[PDB]
Amino acid sequence: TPQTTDAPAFPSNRSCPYQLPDGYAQLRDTPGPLHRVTLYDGRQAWVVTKHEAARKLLGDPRLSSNRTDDNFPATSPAFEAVRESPQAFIGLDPPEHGTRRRMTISEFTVKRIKGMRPEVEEVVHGFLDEMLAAGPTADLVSQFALPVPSMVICRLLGVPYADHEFFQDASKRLVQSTDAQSALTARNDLAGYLDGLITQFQTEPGAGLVGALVADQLANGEIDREELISTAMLLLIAGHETTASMTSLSVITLLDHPEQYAALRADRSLVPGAVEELLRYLAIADIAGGRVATADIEVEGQLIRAGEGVIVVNSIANRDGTVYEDPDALDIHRSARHHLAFGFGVHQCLGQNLARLELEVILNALMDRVPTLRLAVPVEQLVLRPGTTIQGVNELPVTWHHHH
Ligand code: HEM
Ligand SMILES: CCC(C)(C)C(=O)O[C@H]1C[C@@H](C)C=C2C=C[C@H](C)[C@H](CC[C@@H](O)C[C@@H](O)CC(=O)O)[C@H]21
């Protein structure tokens, strides 16, 4: 019998780091904003494949972010770790979501992020000194891409960087876990570490956002101790892994487009616009759109019923040709405005401007100090993460014109 189905398996893995999987490109090319897929357990779900409908549904209050809902579209067995756990505000709906998010916004405002630029530049150049002094070759992930945002978010959260080896390992084991067992164990490792940190800040008040939440909201019973752990865990893990993966993939992508990398190096005013285009193009968090409908929603003839899972795939929506002409082409000179790599609505990425600053400083630093940077292995030799997690590589062997 023929094997063609009306709801293809979802998600799919990338074979090229800066191109949609073949299964996503056909979903992008089907007409209409919605299309059925099949999750890992056999459940069917909706995916959004157009930019305007993705933007409209991300702001529709009839789509809930409640992870604990039984109908929430889980995309892997490892997802049972966050469902079975107390929720941070990413999995909350209004009004409870707003009261929790307000406790954290002070550390991510524009004026606070801009003020952090001297500190971030010191952090980037510090790890660039060490990598260049150790001689080629080098793993760009473990020696630069991961340590730089790790130290920045640790200073922002109040987490001691002296323990970086522990929680970096546990954060990997959680994000790239393939079964619920290794995911549960990694999450418990981070929870146990953070709970000890909370007790530590109750004896002597600490710094950062975690120290402030312990001395203020937790002391007044406005947040549960376990809510504080999930919130701190969310910020810690999002603070490391997203920026590290954007850096690794942005380096890979720019090295495969040397004409645009040359233009970027010649005119640094293009860096902020190239970051926006890289965010649209790469879209490393395109699974970050899971929703469950609480009421019936009509979208251009199609009907989402209450209790159905919806997955807004921002990587597909960022390749909408009616918004960005020739969407599959990298183009640092294009207007990448209104892209959905950071989401949209009340759950729009809290640390989107920290990531913009981190990537801007990092790209300028690599072009200033290692302009001869190239990949020590062919791109096809690299191992990409599957579509069930944050896009990126685990290793990135690089080399350069060395001398000292
Ligand atoms: C670097 C690339 C990044 C990308 C592509 C990205 C992407 C996203 C997306 C798409 C969402 C929406 C999730 C949803 O609607 O369910 C989101 C939310 C969020 N992100 Fe990011 N993010 C990045 C960096 C960061 C950083 C550096 C932080 C640091 C704290 C962060 C913290 C958060 C938080 C706390 C939320 C939840 C917002 C809310 O629920 O109100 N992200 N992110
Ligand atoms: C193992 C699955 C994994 C990768 C954590 C995940 O799919 O997340 C993704 C998808 C979606 C929620 C949005 C995301 C954007 C930024 C973050 C990095 C975020 C981590 C979500 C957070 O929920 C994970 C732990 O914090 C669990 C918890 O706090 O209960 C990430």
Coordinates of C-alpha atoms and ligand atoms in Angstrom, one line a residue:
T1 CA 0.0 0.0 0.0
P2 CA 1.1 3.6 -0.4
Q3 CA 2.6 5.2 2.7
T4 CA 1.4 8.8 2.1
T5 CA -0.4 10.3 5.1
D6 CA -2.3 13.5 5.8
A7 CA -0.4 14.2 9.1
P8 CA 3.4 13.7 8.7
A9 CA 5.6 12.8 11.6
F10 CA 6.7 15.8 13.7
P11 CA 9.2 17.0 14.5
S12 CA 11.9 16.5 11.9
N13 CA 15.7 16.8 12.2
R14 CA 17.8 19.2 10.3
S15 CA 20.5 17.9 7.9
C16 CA 21.9 21.4 7.2
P17 CA 22.1 23.7 10.2
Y18 CA 20.7 26.7 8.4
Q19 CA 18.0 25.1 6.3
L20 CA 14.6 23.8 7.2
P21 CA 14.2 20.0 7.3
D22 CA 12.7 18.7 4.1
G23 CA 9.5 17.9 6.0
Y24 CA 9.3 21.5 7.2
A25 CA 9.8 23.0 3.7
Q26 CA 6.8 21.1 2.4
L27 CA 4.6 22.1 5.4
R28 CA 5.8 25.7 4.5
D29 CA 4.7 25.2 0.9
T30 CA 1.2 23.7 1.6
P31 CA -1.5 26.4 1.4
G32 CA -3.3 27.7 4.4
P33 CA -2.0 28.5 7.9
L34 CA -2.6 25.1 9.6
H35 CA -1.6 21.5 9.0
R36 CA -2.0 18.3 10.9
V37 CA 1.0 16.3 12.1
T38 CA 1.6 13.2 14.2
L39 CA 3.5 13.4 17.5
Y40 CA 5.8 10.7 18.8
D41 CA 3.0 8.9 20.8
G42 CA 0.7 8.8 17.8
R43 CA -1.3 11.9 18.9
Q44 CA -2.3 14.2 16.1
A45 CA -1.7 18.0 16.5
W46 CA -1.8 21.3 14.6
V47 CA 1.3 23.1 13.4
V48 CA 1.2 26.7 12.2
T49 CA 3.0 27.2 8.9
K50 CA 2.4 30.9 8.0
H51 CA 3.7 34.1 9.6
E52 CA 0.5 36.1 9.9
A53 CA -1.4 33.2 11.6
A54 CA 1.5 32.3 13.8
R55 CA 1.6 36.0 14.9
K56 CA -2.2 36.0 15.4
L57 CA -2.4 32.7 17.3
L58 CA 0.5 33.6 19.6
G59 CA -1.6 36.5 20.8
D60 CA -4.9 34.6 21.0
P61 CA -5.8 34.1 24.7
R62 CA -7.8 30.9 23.7
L63 CA -4.4 29.1 23.3
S64 CA -3.1 28.1 26.8
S65 CA 0.5 27.4 27.7
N66 CA -0.4 25.1 30.6
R67 CA 2.2 22.3 30.3
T68 CA 0.4 20.2 32.9
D69 CA -2.7 20.0 30.7
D70 CA -3.1 16.4 29.5
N71 CA -3.7 17.6 25.9
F72 CA -0.5 19.6 25.6
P73 CA 1.5 18.7 22.5
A74 CA 4.6 16.9 23.9
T75 CA 7.1 16.2 21.1
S76 CA 9.4 13.7 22.9
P77 CA 9.4 11.4 26.0
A78 CA 11.9 13.8 27.6
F79 CA 9.1 16.4 27.8
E80 CA 7.4 14.5 30.6
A81 CA 10.0 16.1 32.9
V82 CA 8.6 19.6 32.6
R83 CA 5.0 18.5 32.6
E84 CA 5.5 16.5 35.9
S85 CA 7.2 19.5 37.5
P86 CA 6.1 22.8 39.1
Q87 CA 5.8 25.4 36.4
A88 CA 7.7 28.6 35.8
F89 CA 5.8 31.4 34.2
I90 CA 6.6 30.2 30.7
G91 CA 4.0 27.5 31.3
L92 CA 1.5 29.9 33.0
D93 CA -1.4 31.8 31.6
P94 CA -2.7 35.3 32.6
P95 CA -3.1 36.6 35.2
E96 CA -0.7 34.3 37.2
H97 CA 1.9 34.6 34.3
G98 CA 2.1 38.3 34.6
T99 CA 2.6 38.5 38.4
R100 CA 5.5 36.0 38.1
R101 CA 7.2 37.7 35.0
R102 CA 7.2 41.1 36.7
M103 CA 9.4 39.7 39.4
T104 CA 12.2 39.3 36.8
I105 CA 11.8 42.1 34.3
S106 CA 14.1 44.5 36.2
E107 CA 17.2 42.7 35.1
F108 CA 16.3 42.6 31.4
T109 CA 15.2 46.1 30.6
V110 CA 16.9 47.9 27.7
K111 CA 18.7 50.4 29.9
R112 CA 20.0 47.6 32.1
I113 CA 21.1 45.5 29.1
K114 CA 22.8 48.4 27.5
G115 CA 24.7 49.2 30.7
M116 CA 25.9 45.6 30.8
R117 CA 27.9 46.0 27.5
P118 CA 31.3 46.7 29.1
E119 CA 31.0 43.6 31.3
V120 CA 30.0 41.4 28.4
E121 CA 32.9 42.7 26.3
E122 CA 35.3 41.9 29.1
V123 CA 33.9 38.4 29.4
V124 CA 34.1 37.7 25.6
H125 CA 37.7 39.0 25.2
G126 CA 38.8 37.1 28.4
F127 CA 37.7 33.7 26.9
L128 CA 39.1 34.8 23.5
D129 CA 42.5 35.4 25.0
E130 CA 42.5 31.9 26.6
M131 CA 41.4 30.1 23.4
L132 CA 43.9 31.9 21.2
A133 CA 46.8 31.3 23.6
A134 CA 46.1 27.6 23.8
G135 CA 46.8 27.2 20.1
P136 CA 44.7 25.6 17.3
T137 CA 42.7 23.7 17.1
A138 CA 39.9 24.4 19.5
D139 CA 36.3 23.4 20.3
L140 CA 34.3 26.7 19.9
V141 CA 31.5 25.3 22.0
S142 CA 33.2 24.3 25.2
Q143 CA 35.8 27.0 25.1
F144 CA 33.8 30.1 23.9
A145 CA 30.2 29.6 22.8
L146 CA 29.1 28.1 26.1
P147 CA 31.3 29.7 28.8
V148 CA 30.6 33.3 27.7
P149 CA 26.8 33.4 28.2
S150 CA 27.2 31.1 31.2
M151 CA 29.3 33.6 33.1
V152 CA 27.1 36.5 32.1
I153 CA 23.8 34.9 33.3
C154 CA 25.5 33.6 36.5
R155 CA 26.4 37.1 37.4
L156 CA 22.9 38.3 36.5
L157 CA 21.2 35.5 38.5
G158 CA 23.6 35.5 41.4
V159 CA 24.7 31.9 40.8
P160 CA 28.4 31.3 41.6
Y161 CA 30.4 30.6 38.5
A162 CA 32.7 28.5 40.6
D163 CA 30.1 25.7 40.1
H164 CA 30.0 26.1 36.4
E165 CA 31.1 22.6 35.6
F166 CA 28.1 21.1 37.6
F167 CA 25.1 23.0 36.2
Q168 CA 26.5 23.2 32.7
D169 CA 26.6 19.4 32.6
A170 CA 23.1 19.1 34.2
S171 CA 21.7 21.7 31.8
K172 CA 23.0 19.7 28.8
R173 CA 21.6 16.5 30.2
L174 CA 18.2 18.1 30.5
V175 CA 17.9 19.9 27.2
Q176 CA 19.3 17.0 25.0
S177 CA 17.8 14.1 27.0
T178 CA 15.9 11.6 24.9
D179 CA 14.1 9.7 27.6
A180 CA 12.1 10.9 30.6
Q181 CA 14.4 9.2 33.0
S182 CA 17.6 11.1 32.2
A183 CA 15.6 14.3 31.9
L184 CA 14.1 13.8 35.4
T185 CA 17.5 13.1 36.9
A186 CA 19.1 16.2 35.3
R187 CA 16.2 18.4 36.5
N188 CA 16.5 17.0 40.0
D189 CA 20.2 17.7 40.0
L190 CA 19.6 21.3 39.2
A191 CA 16.7 21.6 41.6
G192 CA 18.7 20.2 44.5
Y193 CA 21.6 22.6 43.8
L194 CA 19.3 25.6 43.6
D195 CA 17.4 24.7 46.8
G196 CA 20.7 24.7 48.6
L197 CA 21.5 28.1 47.1
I198 CA 18.1 29.4 48.4
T199 CA 18.9 28.3 51.9
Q200 CA 22.4 29.9 51.5
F201 CA 20.9 33.3 50.6
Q202 CA 18.5 33.1 53.6
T203 CA 21.5 33.0 56.0
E204 CA 23.5 35.7 54.2
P205 CA 21.7 37.7 51.5
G206 CA 23.1 37.1 48.1
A207 CA 23.5 39.1 44.9
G208 CA 21.7 38.9 41.6
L209 CA 18.0 38.2 40.8
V210 CA 17.9 35.0 42.9
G211 CA 19.2 36.8 46.0
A212 CA 16.6 39.5 45.5
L213 CA 13.7 37.0 45.1
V214 CA 14.8 35.1 48.2
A215 CA 15.0 38.2 50.4
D216 CA 11.8 39.8 49.1
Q217 CA 9.1 37.7 47.3
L218 CA 10.0 34.5 49.1
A219 CA 10.2 36.2 52.5
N220 CA 6.7 37.6 52.0
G221 CA 5.2 34.3 50.7
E222 CA 4.4 35.8 47.3
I223 CA 6.3 32.9 45.6
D224 CA 6.7 29.3 46.5
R225 CA 10.2 27.9 47.2
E226 CA 9.6 25.5 44.3
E227 CA 8.3 28.1 42.0
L228 CA 11.6 30.0 42.7
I229 CA 13.6 27.0 41.7
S230 CA 11.7 26.5 38.4
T231 CA 12.0 30.2 37.6
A232 CA 15.7 30.3 38.4
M233 CA 16.2 27.0 36.5
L234 CA 14.4 28.4 33.5
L235 CA 16.6 31.6 33.4
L236 CA 19.8 29.6 34.0
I237 CA 19.2 27.1 31.2
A238 CA 17.8 29.6 28.8
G239 CA 20.7 31.9 29.6
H240 CA 23.4 29.4 28.6
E241 CA 22.0 27.2 25.8
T242 CA 20.2 29.6 23.5
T243 CA 23.1 32.1 23.1
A244 CA 25.6 29.3 22.8
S245 CA 23.7 27.6 20.0
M246 CA 23.1 30.9 18.2
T247 CA 26.8 31.6 18.3
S248 CA 27.9 28.1 17.0
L249 CA 25.3 28.1 14.2
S250 CA 26.0 31.8 13.3
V251 CA 29.7 31.0 12.9
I252 CA 28.8 27.9 10.7
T253 CA 26.4 29.9 8.7
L254 CA 28.6 33.0 8.1
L255 CA 31.5 30.8 7.0
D256 CA 29.3 29.2 4.3
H257 CA 28.4 32.7 3.1
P258 CA 31.9 34.3 2.9
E259 CA 30.7 37.2 0.7
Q260 CA 28.3 38.3 3.4
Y261 CA 30.8 37.6 6.1
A262 CA 33.3 39.8 4.2
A263 CA 30.7 42.6 4.0
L264 CA 30.0 42.3 7.7
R265 CA 33.7 42.6 8.6
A266 CA 34.0 45.7 6.3
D267 CA 31.1 47.6 7.8
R268 CA 30.3 47.0 11.5
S269 CA 27.2 49.1 11.4
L270 CA 25.6 46.1 9.7
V271 CA 26.1 43.8 12.7
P272 CA 22.8 44.7 14.5
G273 CA 20.9 44.0 11.3
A274 CA 22.8 40.8 10.6
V275 CA 22.0 39.6 14.1
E276 CA 18.2 40.0 13.4
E277 CA 18.6 38.2 10.1
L278 CA 20.6 35.4 11.8
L279 CA 17.8 35.0 14.4
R280 CA 15.2 34.8 11.7
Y281 CA 17.2 32.4 9.5
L282 CA 18.4 30.0 12.2
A283 CA 15.4 30.0 14.6
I284 CA 17.0 27.6 17.1
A285 CA 13.9 27.4 19.3
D286 CA 11.2 26.5 16.8
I287 CA 9.7 23.9 19.1
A288 CA 9.1 26.8 21.6
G289 CA 5.5 27.2 20.4
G290 CA 3.5 24.4 22.1
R291 CA -0.1 25.4 23.0
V292 CA -3.4 23.7 23.8
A293 CA -6.7 25.3 22.8
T294 CA -9.2 26.0 25.6
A295 CA -11.9 27.0 23.1
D296 CA -12.8 26.6 19.5
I297 CA -10.8 28.8 17.2
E298 CA -11.6 29.6 13.5
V299 CA -8.5 30.4 11.4
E300 CA -9.2 31.1 7.7
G301 CA -11.8 28.3 7.3
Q302 CA -9.9 25.8 9.4
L303 CA -11.2 25.0 12.8
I304 CA -9.1 24.3 15.9
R305 CA -11.2 22.6 18.5
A306 CA -10.9 23.0 22.2
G307 CA -8.5 20.4 23.7
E308 CA -6.4 20.1 20.5
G309 CA -2.7 20.7 20.7
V310 CA -1.2 23.5 18.5
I311 CA 2.5 24.0 17.8
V312 CA 3.5 27.4 16.4
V313 CA 6.7 26.6 14.5
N314 CA 8.6 29.9 14.3
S315 CA 11.2 28.5 11.9
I316 CA 8.6 27.8 9.3
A317 CA 6.8 31.1 9.9
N318 CA 10.2 33.0 9.5
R319 CA 10.5 31.4 6.0
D320 CA 7.2 32.9 4.8
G321 CA 7.8 34.2 1.3
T322 CA 4.9 36.7 1.4
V323 CA 6.8 38.5 4.3
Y324 CA 10.5 38.0 3.4
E325 CA 11.1 37.6 -0.3
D326 CA 13.3 34.6 -1.2
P327 CA 13.0 33.5 2.5
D328 CA 15.5 30.6 2.3
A329 CA 18.4 32.9 1.4
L330 CA 20.6 34.5 4.0
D331 CA 20.6 38.2 3.5
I332 CA 22.2 40.5 6.1
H333 CA 21.0 43.5 4.1
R334 CA 17.3 42.5 4.3
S335 CA 14.8 43.9 6.8
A336 CA 14.3 40.9 9.1
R337 CA 11.6 42.8 11.1
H338 CA 8.6 41.1 12.7
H339 CA 10.3 37.7 12.8
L340 CA 9.1 35.2 15.4
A341 CA 12.4 33.7 16.6
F342 CA 11.7 35.3 19.9
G343 CA 7.9 34.5 19.9
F344 CA 5.1 37.0 20.1
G345 CA 2.7 38.2 22.7
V346 CA 2.8 37.9 26.5
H347 CA 5.3 35.1 26.3
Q348 CA 7.7 36.9 24.0
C349 CA 11.3 36.1 25.0
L350 CA 12.2 37.8 28.2
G351 CA 15.9 37.9 27.5
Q352 CA 15.7 38.8 23.8
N353 CA 17.8 41.9 24.2
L354 CA 20.5 40.2 26.3
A355 CA 20.8 37.7 23.4
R356 CA 21.0 40.5 20.9
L357 CA 23.8 42.3 22.9
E358 CA 25.7 39.0 23.5
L359 CA 25.6 38.1 19.8
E360 CA 26.6 41.6 18.6
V361 CA 29.6 41.7 21.0
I362 CA 30.6 38.2 20.1
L363 CA 30.5 38.7 16.3
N364 CA 32.5 41.9 16.5
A365 CA 35.1 40.2 18.8
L366 CA 35.5 37.2 16.4
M367 CA 36.0 39.5 13.4
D368 CA 38.5 41.7 15.3
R369 CA 40.7 39.1 16.9
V370 CA 40.3 35.9 14.8
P371 CA 39.4 37.1 11.2
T372 CA 41.1 34.0 9.8
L373 CA 38.7 31.7 11.8
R374 CA 37.6 28.6 9.8
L375 CA 36.1 25.2 10.5
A376 CA 38.6 22.5 11.2
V377 CA 36.2 19.9 9.7
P378 CA 33.8 19.8 6.8
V379 CA 30.3 20.9 7.7
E380 CA 28.7 17.6 6.7
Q381 CA 30.9 16.0 9.4
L382 CA 29.2 17.9 12.1
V383 CA 26.5 16.3 14.3
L384 CA 23.3 18.3 14.7
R385 CA 20.8 18.1 17.5
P386 CA 17.5 16.5 16.6
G387 CA 14.4 18.5 16.1
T388 CA 13.1 17.7 19.6
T389 CA 15.4 20.2 21.3
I390 CA 17.2 23.4 20.8
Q391 CA 19.0 23.5 17.4
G392 CA 22.8 23.5 17.5
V393 CA 25.9 21.4 17.6
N394 CA 27.7 19.8 20.5
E395 CA 31.2 20.2 19.1
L396 CA 32.6 22.8 16.7
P397 CA 36.3 22.2 15.8
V398 CA 37.8 25.4 14.5
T399 CA 41.3 26.6 13.6
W400 CA 42.9 29.9 12.5
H401 CA 46.1 31.7 11.4
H402 CA 48.0 31.2 14.7
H403 CA 51.1 33.1 16.0
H404 CA 52.5 34.4 19.3
Ligands
HEM1 C1 19.4 33.4 22.0 C2 18.3 33.0 21.4 C3 16.9 32.9 22.0 C4 15.8 32.5 21.4 C5 15.8 32.0 19.9 C6 14.7 32.5 22.3 C7 13.4 32.1 22.0 C8 12.3 32.2 22.8 C9 10.9 32.0 22.4 C10 10.4 31.6 21.0 C11 10.2 32.2 23.5 C12 8.6 32.0 23.5 C13 8.2 30.7 24.1 C14 6.8 30.5 24.1 O1 6.0 31.4 23.6 O2 6.3 29.4 24.6 C15 11.0 32.5 24.6 C16 10.6 32.7 25.9 C17 11.5 33.0 26.9 N1 12.8 33.1 26.9 FE1 14.0 33.1 25.2 N2 15.1 32.9 23.5 C18 16.5 33.2 23.4 C19 17.3 33.7 24.4 C20 16.9 33.8 25.8 C21 17.7 34.3 26.8 C22 19.2 34.7 26.7 C23 17.0 34.2 28.0 C24 17.6 34.7 29.4 C25 16.9 34.7 30.5 C26 15.7 33.7 27.6 C27 14.6 33.6 28.5 C28 13.3 33.4 28.2 C29 12.2 33.3 29.1 C30 12.2 33.6 30.6 C31 11.1 33.1 28.3 C32 9.6 33.0 28.9 C33 8.9 34.3 28.6 C34 7.5 34.3 29.1 O3 7.0 33.2 29.4 O4 6.9 35.4 29.4 N3 15.7 33.5 26.3 N4 12.3 32.5 24.1
LIG2 C1 14.1 19.4 27.3 C2 13.2 20.3 26.5 C3 13.6 21.8 26.5 C4 14.8 22.0 25.6 C5 14.0 22.2 28.0 C6 12.5 22.7 26.1 O1 11.6 22.2 25.3 O2 12.4 24.1 26.5 C7 12.6 25.0 25.4 C8 11.3 25.1 24.5 C9 10.3 26.1 24.9 C10 9.6 25.7 26.3 C11 11.0 27.4 25.0 C12 12.3 27.5 25.3 C13 13.0 28.8 25.1 C14 13.9 29.1 26.1 C15 14.3 28.0 27.1 C16 15.6 27.5 26.8 C17 13.2 26.9 27.2 C18 13.4 26.0 28.4 C19 12.0 25.8 28.9 C20 11.8 25.3 30.4 O3 10.5 25.0 30.6 C21 12.7 24.1 30.7 C22 12.8 23.9 32.2 O4 12.9 25.2 32.8 C23 11.7 23.1 32.7 C24 11.0 23.8 33.9 O5 11.5 24.8 34.3 O6 10.0 23.2 34.4 C25 13.1 26.4 25.8

